[PDB]
Design a protein around this ligand. Structure first.
Ligand SMILES: O=C1Cc2ccccc2N1
Ligand SMILES: O=C1Cc2ccccc2N1
Lengths: 337, 337
């Protein structure tokens, strides 16, 4: 690989908290100084893991394209290492570069997925790599979009967000939004959709609306994917029933945790194979769990085979404890392979 | 260690299925071999524990009991399976071994507590201790299972319920066990708190709709799991607050699933794993995993907790999960930011 990839892969990624990510919007020279270093490091770390993939997979035009994109984006960013953070034109050029890198990486996920489709034409090492590859992309997209959406002139994002972070994320509203999105799709596939039976408990502040610092787009993706699976299971398991049981959602805010449990009566899944739902090929649920774990949360499924399934999202209720969960290429990772 | 320990520890334990457990000469020949093998494997594993733990009077007692039991059992390798008094004496020896091992669980626990309270425990050693205790207690669960099966079936005096085959109920009324275990916890709850939550039970037979839920299982093991879960659910309900405890029993094609739900305020995800560190809850999970089942908790901090038991619905797949002291285990004793 290029010298830059070898060099920057020697560094470990530096995870940020969501609090720190918010603080970038409270300064541009500081985000620029961090990103111009951190993004090459993260691209270089995953580029090293791409090389140890099975040759039949790494040699796919898709994977080779992703590798070429990441290499070029890495070079685009290392060009800014000579510039001074006080150089206003360098900051402006840096925003332009991030936008170019963002657009270049826009189709990474489907391109990588297409690469797996060819390789297939169960693999624990591939699951290991895809968790890391997709978590790495989630993190770089997160960082770059935070800078773009705060410091660009045209890319302003949502006015109520600092970058992509909603400091007062209305969790229940995101739930209702994602449920409608899944409901619209469910109606197209079945001409029927379960209703939502939503409960909320604010143990931290009883009877108070539930807000946390979070990335609503990530939360929406997780809930959308879980609702799609809950609705599909409900309709199909009860297709011979005159009605559909609702999907029960409870949103709970605790001292340390924001918990969302989605319960369906869609027949459940045997314990022996429930993990297959998280194996790639079918990237919705695996990516959803990455999103949950990205900021020290988690996503778990507990099924009652013959009855239904509980899906539970755990998010940290404090932004200071919502720290990036990042893969690093080192001896340990090489040993896992 | 004694020669017999070294010799029999070189054998790997032979797990049986519920179906297998469900001729006195054959059971005699198997147990006189298998019980020393299982005692010898865990005895060798005791020897690699930290010296200050092994030197506690508690661990020395456990070691001395296990060694004596092994020697008692090895003496029957000189007897013929066709010797009538040998079979009869062997039952009396199992009864003696069962009495000698009667206090193993609290004794080992005392040694662990004494060691942790008095000595420094590195993170790896602490993880190794939970690993060892899971394996030590599973080992005991398995030797007690096998010994009791032989005693209950072949003893002239210590025969169990005639409706059961040893300790196994070939048509275990799961719901009946759930109700009984709930009342046992309820009686204890009333005595300490002067009040107890009610039971709201539901059952769904997905394998045989509208039919009673029965599987081949050890009702005593199932009772232990549910009793401990009910104790924690009732303790959490009364202390946090009474909302009832909701239980749903589901029979699927492959799984028998029991979900217990309380509203006792839940537990933060950061520390919920500590509930399974080292004894009722971790041993309860061992019981569930003993025949390839499982026991998980997923809590909504600020609201309540769900506890779910998974049991194999088929006796052929209900196979002992036995620890073995081989190179892989000794390796366990010896990637992400
Ligand atoms: O049957 C199912 C499978 C699944 C995955 C994720 C969420 C809900 C469900 N329900
Ligand atoms: O709060 C809690 C803790 C616990 C452990 C086991 C079962 C139920 C519960 N509830």
């Amino acid at each position: 690989v290029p010298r830059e990839v070898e060099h920057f892969s020697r560094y470990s990624p530096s995870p940020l908290s969501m609090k720190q990510l918010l603080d970038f919007g409270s300064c541009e020279r500081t985000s620029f100084a961090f990103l111009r270093q951190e993004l090459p490091v993260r691209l270089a770390n995953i580029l090293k893991e791409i090389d140890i993939l099975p040759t039949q997979l790494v040699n796919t035009s898709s994977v080779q394209l992703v590798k070429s994109w990441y290499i070029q984006s890495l070079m685009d960013l290392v060009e800014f290492h000579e510039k001074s953070p006080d150089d206003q034109k360098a900051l402006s050029d840096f925003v332009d570069t991030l936008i170019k890198v963002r657009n270049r990486h826009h189709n990474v996920v489907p391109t990588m997925a297409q690469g797996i489709i060819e390789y297939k034409d169960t693999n624990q090492n591939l699951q290991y790599f895809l968790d890391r590859f997709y978590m790495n992309r989630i993190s770089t997209r997160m960082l770059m979009n935070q800078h773009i959406l705060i410091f660009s002139d045209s890319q302003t994002g949502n006015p109520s967000h600092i970058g992509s972070i909603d400091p007062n994320c209305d969790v229940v509203a995101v739930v209702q939004d994602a449920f409608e999105c899944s409901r619209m799709l469910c109606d197209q596939y079945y001409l029927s959709s379960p209703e939502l039976k939503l409960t909320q408990v604010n143990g931290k502040f009883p009877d108070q609306p539930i807000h946390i610092v979070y990335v609503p787009s990530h939360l929406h993706h997780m809930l959308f994917e879980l609702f799609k699976n809950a609705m599909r299971a409900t309709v199909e398991h009860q297709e011979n029933q005159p009605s559909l049981t609702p999907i029960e959602v409870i949103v709970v805010l605790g001292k340390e945790d924001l918990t969302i449990k989605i319960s369906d009566r869609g027949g459940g899944v045997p314990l022996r194979i429930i993990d297959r739902l998280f194996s790639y090929t079918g990237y919705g649920l695996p990516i959803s769990r990455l999103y949950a774990k990205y900021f020290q949360g988690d996503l778990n499924l507990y099924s009652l085979s013959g009855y239904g399934t509980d899906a539970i999202i755990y998010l940290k209720a404090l932004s200071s404890e919502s720290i990036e969960k990042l893969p690093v290429f080192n001896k340990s990772a090489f040993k896992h392979y």
